[PDB]
């Protein structure tokens, strides 16, 4: 069965863990609604942080979701482009899904929405 | 129908956004070239830079692949490695497909002609 | 039939290539004794490695296991995270199967079988 990313991008005001893990959970709570999302659909995901952000893995708030303790996640910083915007994390979340690629729900929020095409 | 990873990587001669641009769209043309992709058969694409390109992000490239705006990318820091190919972009297209793994055209462009397997 | 990621986790002492190859080899050949994977039912590999390790890229390990020379594999700088695992190697391993998504078995050796979770 076919298989799709599904993008997502927020923003921190601060480095902390509270507010990383926070977003974090927001964000992928988010792309759970808007494209029906069940775990076991789900391939891998990748989540990466502006070199500007260390306080936790953004994958810890993972585990704050019930039922998604066997999805497999890592962690990588995205590339750091000049004037590019700061405090940013982004999900590449690979699915199982029918849904055609014209009609799969991206996520953009907080000051992410500046990415939205 | 199985899914495939389709490698390519090429560089820039300066980090500026013309070069980056130029490079990265060159390069995924050739991989669409040799490999027949339509975009609607790409899952996702994860592009990396080397950390001494900061100019832009490669992913603006494939918003100028027309019928590519709905194809998922994100991008990310290539390791550092001491000896390593300098201002190096890489392309991973995930793409159904039917041709077997050891026939799959992988594509090595500019100086990264060296990365050839 | 799916598609699903099998993720692995390890360290090394010092940033040489000879550890690094060695460990890396290491941590594949558990993944595939464990999920009894074979390389054309890969679909690519993303190895990762903390911003302290510099000597090669991972990646080349693939290259000597018998079978896997059409593996595509792309690497890439794991997130920097405050008081995280120094020297750590990690892949997500993209593989068809049809092991449900809680039985895949992710492996940690090394110092980062604290990750084991």
Same mark, same amino acid.
């Given at each position: 069965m *076919?298989?799709r990313?599904? #993008?997502?991008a927020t $923003?921190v005001?601060r %480095?902390?863990?509270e507010?990383?893990?926070?977003? $974090?959970?927001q /964000? /992928?709570e988010?792309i759970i609604?808007?494209?029906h999302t069940?775990?076991? %659909?789900?391939?891998q *995901? /990748?989540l990466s942080? !502006?070199? %500007?952000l @260390?306080?936790?893995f953004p994958a810890?708030?993972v585990?704050?979701?019930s039922?998604? &303790?066997?999805?497999?996640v $890592? =962690?990588?910083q995205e *590339? %750091?482009?000049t004037?590019?915007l700061?405090? =940013?994390i #982004?999900?590449? *979340?690979t699915?199982? !899904?029918?849904v055609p &690629?014209?009609?799969?729900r @991206?996520?953009?929020?907080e ?5 939205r095409?």
């Open positions: *076919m298989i990313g599904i #993008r997502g $923003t005001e %480095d902390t863990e507010e990383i893990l926070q977003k $974090t959970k /964000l /992928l988010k609604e808007e494209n069940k775990p076991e %659909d789900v391939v *995901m /990748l942080a !502006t070199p %500007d @260390h306080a936790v810890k708030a585990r704050e979701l039922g998604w &303790q066997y999805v497999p $890592t =962690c990588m *590339m %750091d482009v004037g590019g700061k405090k =940013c #982004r999900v590449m *979340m699915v199982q !899904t029918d &690629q014209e009609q799969i @991206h996520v953009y929020l000051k992410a929405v500046v990415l095409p």
